Structure 1
């Protein structure tokens, strides 16, 4: 905020824009208020009643989410695992010593305070096997509006056909709209998140197949973090080294935003990956909506470094495409030229001995490592304009790309450097 005046008449002007809060909620700021997350559920009706409730309800268009929650409880209540080591997260010691932990030890059971429904018989305990797998799979199916990508219902149908050969989807085609509402019931999401969190620790459980459909709950609305992992993998550099190659102020603020020190983002098994479905946070701090310049920058740099995932990563709105693209060009060019090949194994204890008697002064050549302090200086020697070898390198990287979707950084990079 600095004073601005109109030079024709010395009139003072106050340039101001509309403001949008859109604050950010971290997971660990939820647990300092409540030391436990509740699961609202109805424990009145019996299991074999709920089986026909949700089977006959599934066959038709009418079904109560309260009945699929109350059915998923008792349908998954007697599933267990033995902890090899202790399990604690955000001050919640879920598992103590060698005692076995169930799938609902993670949350606390509360009572929901009713749907009349309709019942069915002849439904044995052989449907308790896959009906949870089904209802869990429709959460992953019912989150995508693409007509052919929603055909993951064929892979849920297949994964249950593996459990019982004569399994065919008990839902009408109009059902493409039936389970789309299930994702709005907080307790259903608190169920799928507990299922995925449970089966992440107990990996080779006989019912680990249930994780299909709930795997989309892990790190949901946390794309930018996964782009940081993808960049730290594609570049081959450490997290602290990649962190230095951030040359844009927005990516700096966002990188400071993701790396707050008390959110267990590094723990293997934690409540953090499920901060959205558990209700630990209503606005994730690790999304590509609150970290747009980081998503664009890291994804584009990866794409220039021969990435495959980035070919379909989406281009955010309202960011500095020019500065971000130049930064990704210098970074990807630095990593591209500096392969840093070094001998690793020797036979007769003979290693490569570099020759230091090269004194013809081979200057005006790019640096030898991947240090930012040297590539910024070389780039200054290039007048902060990308050299034709950099632009040609990027053209080499983005050309021969085919089948590119619109609004993706693959078509963006191709449309930017391939001409």
Structure 2
């Protein structure tokens, strides 16, 4: 399986690929080399002075991100919370049981020389800072990282959360307004504050200032789509993680699952730095990136869609994967779940249904297994000469037909194109 030759000549030929190896970065590796998350923010100035730069800056659509970050650090500086138990993530002792700390558990550093942005300021601005303005700024990050006209849907979210505080005020321009949010995400330090806010209030959910977390929720598990897909697949099939894993039927998907489930990364932990590995700067290429798990993304979503999911309808269709093989496996899994409903009873009145009697091949040797055991189904499928039965094709036909208005380059579109013949 190494030496190839052309038959007519009998000469060795070595098959070669351009080969691009770009590896993932686990969160634990960051803290192997550094014990702090640096936040570069130009201090100086004053809360009242920075409030004027921002308030006026937003109204004109030219405010500096440096000013925004400086204001955000000032207004959120005094917010504190008391810990019931010790708080530790990747060896960092954030706090003990008893004592208090603020939102900035990470170590802050001070930015460069004189500020290039010179002016645009409101002199007489009231101390209504902490209340509503930081909510607004952090809320623009969420409105920022959408591209479809769902803007107005999520931009009203912000306004509604600000209305719970004071008078109704919309600040940016209509067409040009969108442009001054897109860069904000691309700022490393704005991005960190967002993640720090989200993490802090995830610990303190019952805190009064928990409303800040509305624009910043979209930071938790950013680029960790692979972990959500695994979760959704458990819920839609109703099988535990263990069982779902035994139903992986392709090598590429198995590789991706072991990459996903590397131990010591605090994935199932309640309050970890992990969910913000991209925003905190712990990773540049996430192991839970959906593009870094192409086969599992396709297999997971395609199976879930055939089991009547709505999330999978619009999921991206990856390139450079085994379309044909991954579908067959995905279809077989979906057919096994959808056929085998197995509905035991849960409540009774002295009158029970004894069930573990009579379970064999109902339609002679043609009948499918009664349950969801992958070994049973592999046996049955290999009896079917390893090609989908006219019943299985009809099952998927029904799962995709009567699906309406599908996007280009999509799981849904693929699925309907493939099965709705």
Q: Which TM-score bucket, shorter chain as reference? A: over 0.9
Offset of residue 272 of structure 1? 0.3
Aligned-partner Cα distance in 1 for 2:223–2:361: 54
TM-score, with length taken from structure 2: 0.95
1:305 deviates by 0.9
Give structure 2 stretches of 5+ with no counterpart.
Answer: none
Q: Which moved more, 1:123-132 or 1:259-268?
A: 123-132
Q: What's the offset of the Cα at 1:106?
A: 4.1
Distance 1:358 1:46 in 2: 78
Q: Cα RMSD over matched residues? A: 2.0
The verdict on how the C-alpha distance between 1:121 and 1:16 changes in structure 2, with shifts beyond 3 A counting, is: same
For the structure 1 residues 361 and 234, does the alpha-carbon distance in structure 2 shift closer, same or farther, using more than 3 Å as the test? closer
Q: Give the C-alpha shift of residue 277 in structure 1.
A: 0.4
Query: Which whole-Å CA distance do the structure 1 matches of 2:71 and 2:312 have between them?
Result: 40
Partner deviation per Cα, 1:291-320 (whole Å, 9 max, x = no partner): 011011001100111111111111111211
> Is the contact between residue 159 and residue 168 of structure 2 (CA under 8 Å) also seen in structure 1?
no
Q: Within 5 A, what are the aligned runs for 1:19-38?
A: 19-38=19-38
Q: Is contact 1:276-1:282 (8 Å) kept?
A: yes
Change (3 A) 1:360 1:263: closer
Note closer, same or farther for the CA distance 1:148–1:387 as it changes in structure 2 (3 Å cut): same
Q: Note closer, same or farther for the CA distance 1:337–1:164 as it changes in structure 2 (3 Å cut).
A: same
User: How far apart are 1:157 and its partner, in Å?
Assistant: 2.3
Deviation at 1:404, TM superposition (A): 1.7
Between the aligned partners of 2:299 and 2:152, the Cα distance in structure 1 is: 29
String of CA shifts for 1:226-255, please: whole Å, max 9, x gaps: 100000111111101101100111101100
Equivalent pairs, count: 419
TM-score (norm: length of structure 1):
0.95
State the 1:60 CA deviation.
1.8
* Gap runs ≥5 in structure 1: none
What does residue 344 of structure 1 align with? 346
Post-superposition offset of 1:165: 2.8
* Alpha-carbon spacing, 1:161–1:356, altered in 2? closer, same or farther (3 Å): closer
**Residues 365-394 of structure 1, C-alpha deviations (whole Å, 9 max, x = no match):** 111111111111100000110011111111
User: Contact conserved, 1:161 with 1:168, CA < 8 A, in 2?
Assistant: no
- Listed as ranges, the matches of 1:10-409 within 5 Å are 10-110=10-110, 112-113=112-113, 115-149=117-151, 151-171=153-173, 173-348=175-350, 350-356=352-358, 362-409=364-411
TM superposition shift of 1:47: 0.3
Cα distance, 1:213–1:15 mapped onto 2, change above 3 Å: same
Greater mean deviation of Cα atoms: 148-157 or 61-70: 148-157
Residue 270 to residue 8, structure 1, CA distance change in 2 (3 Å): same
